[PDB]
Amino acid sequence: STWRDFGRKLRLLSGYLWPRGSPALQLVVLICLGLMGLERALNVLVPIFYRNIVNLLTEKAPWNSLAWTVTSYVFLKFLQGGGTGSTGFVSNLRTFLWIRVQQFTSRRVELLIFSHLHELSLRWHLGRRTGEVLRIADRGTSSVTGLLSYLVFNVIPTLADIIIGIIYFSMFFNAWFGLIVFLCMSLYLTLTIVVTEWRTKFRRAMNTQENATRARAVDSLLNFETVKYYNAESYEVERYREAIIKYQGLEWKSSASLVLLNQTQNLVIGLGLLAGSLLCAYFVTEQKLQVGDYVLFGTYIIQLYMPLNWFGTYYRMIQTNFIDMENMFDLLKEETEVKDLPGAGPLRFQKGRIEFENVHFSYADGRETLQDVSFTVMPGQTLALVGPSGAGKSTILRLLFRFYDISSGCIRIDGQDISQVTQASLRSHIGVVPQDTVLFNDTIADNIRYGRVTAGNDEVEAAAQAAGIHDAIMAFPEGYRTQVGERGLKLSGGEKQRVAIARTILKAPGIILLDEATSALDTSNERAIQASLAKVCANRTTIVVAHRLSTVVNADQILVIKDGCIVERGRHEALLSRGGVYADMWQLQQG
Amino acid sequence: STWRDFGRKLRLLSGYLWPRGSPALQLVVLICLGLMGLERALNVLVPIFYRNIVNLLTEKAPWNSLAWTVTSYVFLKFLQGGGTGSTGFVSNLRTFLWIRVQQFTSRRVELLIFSHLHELSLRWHLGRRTGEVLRIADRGTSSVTGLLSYLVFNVIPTLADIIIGIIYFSMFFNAWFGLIVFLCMSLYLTLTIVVTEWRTKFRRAMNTQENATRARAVDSLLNFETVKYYNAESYEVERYREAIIKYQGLEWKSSASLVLLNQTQNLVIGLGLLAGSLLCAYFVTEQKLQVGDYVLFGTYIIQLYMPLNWFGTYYRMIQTNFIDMENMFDLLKEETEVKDLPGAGPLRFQKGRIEFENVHFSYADGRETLQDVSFTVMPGQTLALVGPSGAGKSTILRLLFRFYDISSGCIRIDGQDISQVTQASLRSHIGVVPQDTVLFNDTIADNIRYGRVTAGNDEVEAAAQAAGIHDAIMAFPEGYRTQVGERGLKLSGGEKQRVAIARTILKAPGIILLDEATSALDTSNERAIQASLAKVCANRTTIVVAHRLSTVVNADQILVIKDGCIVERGRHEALLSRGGVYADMWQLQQG
Ligand SMILES: CC(C)CCC[C@@H](C)[C@H]1CC[C@H]2[C@@H]3CC=C4C[C@@H](OC(=O)CCC(=O)O)CC[C@]4(C)[C@H]3CC[C@]12C
Ligand SMILES: CC(C)CCC[C@@H](C)[C@H]1CC[C@H]2[C@@H]3CC=C4C[C@@H](OC(=O)CCC(=O)O)CC[C@]4(C)[C@H]3CC[C@]12C
Ligand SMILES: CC(C)CCC[C@@H](C)[C@H]1CC[C@H]2[C@@H]3CC=C4C[C@@H](OC(=O)CCC(=O)O)CC[C@]4(C)[C@H]3CC[C@]12C
Ligand SMILES: CC(C)CCC[C@@H](C)[C@H]1CC[C@H]2[C@@H]3CC=C4C[C@@H](OC(=O)CCC(=O)O)CC[C@]4(C)[C@H]3CC[C@]12C
Ligand SMILES: CC(C)CCC[C@@H](C)[C@H]1CC[C@H]2[C@@H]3CC=C4C[C@@H](OC(=O)CCC(=O)O)CC[C@]4(C)[C@H]3CC[C@]12C
Ligand SMILES: CC(C)CCC[C@@H](C)[C@H]1CC[C@H]2[C@@H]3CC=C4C[C@@H](OC(=O)CCC(=O)O)CC[C@]4(C)[C@H]3CC[C@]12C
Ligand SMILES: CC(C)CCC[C@@H](C)[C@H]1CC[C@H]2[C@@H]3CC=C4C[C@@H](OC(=O)CCC(=O)O)CC[C@]4(C)[C@H]3CC[C@]12C
Ligand SMILES: CC(C)CCC[C@@H](C)[C@H]1CC[C@H]2[C@@H]3CC=C4C[C@@H](OC(=O)CCC(=O)O)CC[C@]4(C)[C@H]3CC[C@]12C
Ligand SMILES: CC(C)CCC[C@@H](C)[C@H]1CC[C@H]2[C@@H]3CC=C4C[C@@H](OC(=O)CCC(=O)O)CC[C@]4(C)[C@H]3CC[C@]12C
Ligand SMILES: CC(C)CCC[C@@H](C)[C@H]1CC[C@H]2[C@@H]3CC=C4C[C@@H](OC(=O)CCC(=O)O)CC[C@]4(C)[C@H]3CC[C@]12C
Ligand SMILES: CC(C)CCC[C@@H](C)[C@H]1CC[C@H]2[C@@H]3CC=C4C[C@@H](OC(=O)CCC(=O)O)CC[C@]4(C)[C@H]3CC[C@]12C
Ligand SMILES: CC(C)CCC[C@@H](C)[C@H]1CC[C@H]2[C@@H]3CC=C4C[C@@H](OC(=O)CCC(=O)O)CC[C@]4(C)[C@H]3CC[C@]12C
Ligand SMILES: CC(C)CCC[C@@H](C)[C@H]1CC[C@H]2[C@@H]3CC=C4C[C@@H](OC(=O)CCC(=O)O)CC[C@]4(C)[C@H]3CC[C@]12C
Ligand SMILES: CC(C)CCC[C@@H](C)[C@H]1CC[C@H]2[C@@H]3CC=C4C[C@@H](OC(=O)CCC(=O)O)CC[C@]4(C)[C@H]3CC[C@]12C
Ligand SMILES: CC(C)CCC[C@@H](C)[C@H]1CC[C@H]2[C@@H]3CC=C4C[C@@H](OC(=O)CCC(=O)O)CC[C@]4(C)[C@H]3CC[C@]12C
Ligand SMILES: CC(C)CCC[C@@H](C)[C@H]1CC[C@H]2[C@@H]3CC=C4C[C@@H](OC(=O)CCC(=O)O)CC[C@]4(C)[C@H]3CC[C@]12C
Ligand SMILES: CC(C)CCC[C@@H](C)[C@H]1CC[C@H]2[C@@H]3CC=C4C[C@@H](OC(=O)CCC(=O)O)CC[C@]4(C)[C@H]3CC[C@]12C
Ligand SMILES: CC(C)CCC[C@@H](C)[C@H]1CC[C@H]2[C@@H]3CC=C4C[C@@H](OC(=O)CCC(=O)O)CC[C@]4(C)[C@H]3CC[C@]12C
């Protein structure tokens, strides 16, 4: 069960490790593994040369062979680099080469997560805040690369190093030395495991007390006026010092525990070194070992102990790493609510009709739904989606864009149901003029060019001229290519509105879901917007949604939505003659 | 100049180090210094014993003396603990004892800063946000203790260790070995210094690029609706890919530089080890040194090199530490704007009069001042401080509490000018009822007992009964001692208002600067507040400030402030007969 899941997690890590496409990175990782094996050989070979040097000195060896032996050992030591600190040539070269591989896998996972996040639905994005999602994403990617590197380069190589050391001592020394080192490692790890949990128990409550102390301090200083009112400066410093005293007590518990842990580890190392040194001294006394074996044991056992010092640090790090990785996988586990059907054919859009019929959209987490809405819009016409201020208006536009899935009913464009056609093909033929146009942190060229990435500067200039903003574009200080955005030059409502008009001009849509922004910047500017809007909406189909009544006058068909169902339909004079909510609401808003 | 300032800073650190009062901590630090000297002796004594062991093995020494020599060396090694990692008994004991000393100094500096912060003026507190001040304070305290420990225990001891090593090699070996180690340390430090600045230059721009990449990513995801509008998922992942690629390039520059730094240090160590090993091998070949000297040099030179590995880490840490300390000292450099005069005598308050006369308060960072305000309030009277909504009303109350210093004029209470009397004595006889009462995170007992810390539960209950809140206190779920605050049970406007009434009841003031909260919770509750207000204000002098006109009816003297000067003074009927702004504003607010 859980072991099978762990195996799948390991399989996924293995799949992330190997570069599938690049042929050079496969050679890089193969070279890296070779360097790892070589570094293992260096660690076991250095003490043998140190023994050889000492055995040559203890006898009267000539300077000729001694010189080459000493130089060879130092070169061998230079490659190894000793224990922790001052890493050797092989380890540094292996770390230098692994940079490209870890960058490649980090980039691949980052793009996979980002593409998936954009592939989800609108409802999920409204439900969740994006900041924590980005935090989960980056933590997951860092966790994956860090966990992969640590497991392959730090844990397994050293476990092999300890096994090799035990095998060497048991074979080429008396088997007692193999027993001594085995018992030392068993005791060393067992004691570190059983003490670290005790230490972290003390560590946990320290943070909570630290957070509690400063909260009282900042609350004392924030209400400065009341403190001065009642003369409680001495009283509040006394309370602060008492909270400090408690925090100091927790600090002492944690620090004392850490000192005990270090002393226990040092003691275990000392006892193991004592047992080996005395046994080796006895055997060399009785003409069974040589003088070089004493120093070989002394150097090698310390070489074996040094890596184990960081066992606690990775133990408390690997747990956080794994939960972050699981959190990332949980993030990728989500699926799109609104899915494309297996058919997902293109769109047979020739001229473009619109037909709603008995659309009973059950809107989640909201009290505003739509019940029995049904109307048709022929090509080259209008339909004003005016009515009381409710969520049912914009729900129609977002439901026609397939932002939200149908609940009950059918949507027909040119006689084709929109559910079977793919998402992009349907969505490409729809142009929207949002309530508040959004500009990114870039120039004017690539903000107007966002409606179609493949467009030259002449084309975007013609589009700006057609919209009617080119004069302001030229009048801008930096020229046609000024910096406009949240980090750059600010623009007015009409400026961004005509940007969106230019965007939808070069989008070349078939049906426009025009929404009135009704920002009411200037009446003359509003008329200019209307003139440009008639220019961009000429000879096409629009579903104008207006919060005012000016554009409702010219609509061929005019609809009033009674909080989910259409109540009045026809023409403005006909609806004024009907004298429902239309008549008095028009009288109120006209004066 | 700057060196003199550095010397003063060192003197201040020295003053912070030594516990002035506690007699036990002086013994603790003296023991700690002794342990430091002992640890230096251990570091120089261990290799001598290792040489002794090897020289005994190389000859046919009996097992009797060899056993004690080996055990003595291992015990000596256990005390030392070797190099970095697995610290010895002496170092752990020294760290264990230093906890109390660093806690004591950290607590003392923390309380000094907090007391100073409360000792400043209101204007400074309004000007600056408190959160960053707390951050500066805690960073300064941690910087002081961290820098003190590092300088006394890590830099100086090792500088002594290197000097001792050079002296030993020059004296008890040939002086060539002293030259070799001196050249190695000079080259090692010089190369680390000249490479670290180059490395951090590469490191600086990496952070800026990292911040720039994620900003584009999060801006892409925040505007999800527009991305889906224009079909730019592929376009945006491409932009994210390119930004990632640039960040990877900066990462590679930084990582490559670090690898070069490590390789350079390792190579310098190797060359120094090569020179010493070959020279020592030659001398032991020519019957000038013994076989134990070869291992003595090998162990000692590595013992000397190991500490220098962290030179970069403290170099990049000490700079941040010092600037944080300077920032803290800058914070403590500020002085109070409103100071007590050297006289600062008590107050001869017997019955209590109030006299303003030609007070031309020039209010900073504000357009509302007060020009020629002059009125007198006899004991047991009223004075309604009503008028148009301006900052000149509350400025009178805060100017009488001496939050702000006088600018031009005199303030007399019972014929005594308040400037000469001390701050606390004047401020103790004034009771204020603020606009919005503030409650801390504590119980009912110590919230109403905040008006006077020395009070029993019977007294606070009687005060609550007099105010009129005891019934609600009993009705609370937890009883008389419920948890009320921002983290506890919430209370209404009338609840906290009667809390403040109880506070000022047990404050026992002489003159009350009553300010009407006019929260308008309930009309009956407002009448109850008025009845309690008359109960607490009976037979004392009040300067009632009302944003409404109900309490202005009963005032003996009624004032209207014309945005800095009093325009109308007298009684409500007399002012209604004058028929200025009083008459029409009363008619407007009465209906
Ligand atoms: C250090 C020297 C003096 C002795 C050891 C020689 C070789 C063991 C090493 C040193 C540098 C290595 C090269 C450094 C960089 C690369 C680039 C590497 O390709 C990539 O990084 C491609 C990246 C991508 O496709 O995105 C392929 C291996 C290669 C040629 C390496 C092959 C193995 C080399 C020659
Ligand atoms: C898969 C990864 C973890 C790499 C593992 C490599 C080891 C299985 C091998 C590779 C080369 C071996 C070394 C090659 C040569 C020698 C010399 C050998 O010399 C002797 O004392 C025995 C020979 C003799 O009797 O003269 C001692 C073992 C040692 C260091 C070997 C130890 C085991 C090593 C490191
Ligand atoms: C890492 C880079 C900077 C290169 C470092 C150079 C060393 C590898 C060289 C420089 C001096 C050389 C040494 C100079 C002299 C000798 C004596 C030589 O003795 C002989 O057999 C020849 C002399 C004689 O006949 O007595 C043996 C090699 C050795 C130790 C040499 C070994 C190689 C050394 C250490
Ligand atoms: C995985 C790690 C912890 C290594 C553990 C492997 C053990 C099963 C080995 C290593 C040491 C071995 C022992 C080391 C040496 C000897 C001495 C040998 O007997 C003699 O040499 C007798 C000498 C005499 O009588 O003077 C009998 C096996 C024994 C106990 C060995 C039995 C098997 C042991 C315990
Ligand atoms: C001389 C050589 C053989 C080493 C002996 C050193 C001992 C003095 C140390 C080593 C391990 C220590 C123990 C390691 C862990 C614990 C558990 C600790 O309590 C818990 O962690 C219990 C928490 C729980 O699991 O509920 C109390 C101290 C104690 C017994 C320690 C007491 C002191 C011990 C025995
Ligand atoms: C010089 C070398 C040998 C280090 C010696 C240091 C000791 C004097 C310190 C290290 C850890 C300390 C202990 C750390 C924590 C505790 C638990 C503390 O009690 C609890 O917190 C109980 C918790 C529970 O009941 O679960 C009482 C003190 C004690 C035993 C401390 C006593 C003093 C100890 C043994
Ligand atoms: C907790 C860690 C540090 C392990 C501690 C284990 C030691 C206490 C044990 C392991 C092997 C033991 C040794 C194994 C074999 C011998 C040889 C034995 O004498 C012989 O067999 C002589 C052989 C001959 O003369 O040929 C005397 C005891 C002694 C030293 C033993 C004494 C106790 C030792 C060192
Ligand atoms: C770190 C803790 C676990 C203590 C480690 C203690 C060992 C290092 C001691 C205990 C047993 C000792 C051995 C016990 C017996 C002998 C046999 C003894 O030989 C004799 O002269 C008596 C026997 C005979 O007559 O042959 C020489 C010392 C020696 C090897 C001792 C060497 C040192 C040993 C291994
Ligand atoms: C059988 C069970 C109990 C697991 C045992 C696994 C250990 C053998 C592993 C886990 C953590 C490892 C250590 C984790 C971290 C380090 C530091 C690492 O080097 C660095 O990252 C240096 C960082 C620095 O210098 O600040 C080299 C491997 C090493 C010594 C590792 C050595 C092997 C250890 C002890
Ligand atoms: C570790 C042992 C087996 C050998 C070494 C003995 C002494 C060098 C050390 C060990 C513990 C030390 C004691 C540990 C704790 C204290 C408390 C200390 O007082 C305080 O911490 C007072 C704090 C305050 O007043 O706020 C005075 C020194 C003293 C007695 C120390 C004196 C020196 C002692 C006895
Ligand atoms: C103020 C702080 C930095 C402590 C500094 C202490 C050192 C000045 C002293 C204290 C004890 C000294 C040690 C005491 C005894 C010896 C034995 C001495 O033995 C010899 O080889 C010379 C004697 C002889 O000729 O037999 C070598 C120096 C050494 C380690 C001394 C080195 C210098 C030490 C560490
Ligand atoms: C850290 C705590 C857990 C205490 C550790 C105990 C050690 C300090 C003891 C246990 C065994 C002792 C050894 C046992 C036997 C001997 C042989 C002994 O030789 C003799 O002169 C007596 C035997 C004979 O007559 O042959 C010399 C001391 C020595 C190494 C002893 C030194 C002190 C040792 C290592
Ligand atoms: C602060 C650190 C870097 C130590 C620097 C101190 C130097 C001024 C000392 C240390 C080594 C000394 C040198 C080491 C040995 C000798 C050999 C000595 O002459 C001989 O022994 C001649 C032998 C022969 O002719 O065979 C003359 C002094 C000299 C050059 C010494 C001069 C003074 C030196 C450079
Ligand atoms: C064989 C032994 C003697 C060691 C020689 C190793 C060299 C290959 C290393 C050691 C120091 C290195 C240098 C250390 C620092 C710099 C400065 C660095 O550029 C800067 O930092 C300049 C910035 C500025 O100050 O404006 C360019 C590389 C360089 C010359 C390095 C080139 C490679 C060097 C010479
Ligand atoms: C295997 C051991 C010997 C390490 C060898 C690693 C080298 C291949 C790396 C380490 C640092 C790298 C250098 C780090 C930074 C730079 C600066 C870079 O140019 C700049 O950024 C210029 C900056 C300026 O003009 O100020 C060009 C590549 C270069 C020389 C790199 C070239 C490759 C180097 C020398
Ligand atoms: C960059 C760092 C690693 C320093 C490198 C310095 C070495 C290259 C120098 C320092 C001292 C020099 C040595 C100083 C003295 C001697 C002894 C000299 O011969 C004698 O004086 C013999 C004396 C006698 O026979 O009594 C031959 C050269 C040699 C080895 C010198 C060779 C070059 C050495 C090792
Ligand atoms: C790490 C870098 C700086 C290179 C380090 C090189 C040294 C370790 C070499 C270079 C000079 C060498 C010395 C040069 C001269 C001599 C004299 C030579 O004696 C002879 O037989 C020739 C002279 C005579 O006839 O007396 C023996 C080797 C020795 C000590 C050499 C020992 C090794 C030394 C110190
Ligand atoms: C003459 C000028 C160029 C200044 C030279 C000062 C150095 C000799 C100092 C500065 C930083 C020091 C190091 C900074 C940090 C450490 C780690 C410190 O131990 C720890 O804090 C361990 C932390 C861990 O294990 O994570 C012990 C001292 C040491 C080696 C210091 C040794 C002495 C150093 C190299």
Numbering used by the authors:
A (entry chain B), B (entry chain A): 237 to 827
Give passages from the manuscript.
One superfamily member, human ATP-binding cassette sub-family B member 6 (ABCB6), has been implicated in several seemingly disparate diseases. ABCB6 is expressed ubiquitously as a half transporter which homodimerizes to form a functional transporter. ABCB6 is a porphyrin transporter that is abundant in erythroid cells, where it is capable of accelerating porphyrin biosynthesis and protecting against porphyrin overload. ABCB6 has been implicated in dyschromatosis universalis hereditaria, a condition characterized by hyperpigmented and hypopigmented skin macules.
Our final model is in good agreement with other deposited ABCB6 structures in the inward-facing conformation. Notably, the resolution of our cryo-EM structure (2.93 Å) is higher than previous cryo-EM structures. In addition to the canonical TMD and NBD, ABCB6 contains an additional N-terminal TMD termed TMD0. In most of the published structures in detergent and nanodiscs, including our own, density for the TMD0 is missing from the final model. In our preparation of ABCB6 in DDM/CHS, the TMD0 is too flexible to emerge in the 2D class projections. We prioritized the global resolution of the structure over the TMD0 so that the resulting structure would be appropriate for MD simulations. Using our cryo-EM structure of ABCB6 WT, MD simulations were employed to study the effect of the L356P mutation on ABCB6 structure. Conversely, the elongated loop of the L356P mutant extended across the ATP binding site, occluding the site, and causing direct clashes with the overlayed binding conformation of ATP.
